[PDB]
């Protein structure tokens, strides 16, 4: 069960800009999902050799977590909220069709997911 490379999170030749989307991206979306009791299965890239998921990455084309995520805000990866917000939703989406309907780690997505719509609810106006 081989593990991809983890996706980029630092863009060399991309310059250093913060918008208040991103500032709420980081500060208040990543930073309350990330220290809720349900983050840690989405904190890093899904080891499928330490969890021995031979078909994972067979099935989930577009890996993404919350490692990830977090790193990318943290270097500025992102030109806008939306690429982030979408790596969001992708994390989700591959939890949601990868696992049973009436497994932990979906009613996990499903608390996060939840926190996660609630707070882009009310997403800075782009300015
Ligand atoms: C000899 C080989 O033995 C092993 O496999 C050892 N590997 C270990 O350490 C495995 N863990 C910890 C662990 C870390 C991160 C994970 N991330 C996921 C996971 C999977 C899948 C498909 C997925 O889609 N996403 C997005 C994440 N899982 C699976 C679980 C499946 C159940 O629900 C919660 C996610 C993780 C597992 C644990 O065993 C462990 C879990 C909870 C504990 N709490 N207590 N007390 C203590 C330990």
Redo the contacts with the bound molecule.
Sequence with gaps: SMNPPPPETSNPNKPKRQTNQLQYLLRVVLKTLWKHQFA???QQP?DAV????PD?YKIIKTPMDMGTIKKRLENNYYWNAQECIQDFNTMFTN?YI??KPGD??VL?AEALEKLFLQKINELPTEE
């Excluded at 330490?50 to 998921?53: S, T, V, W």
């Design positions: 840690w299965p989405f899904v330490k969890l021995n998921l994972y939890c990868y696992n932990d780690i996990m």
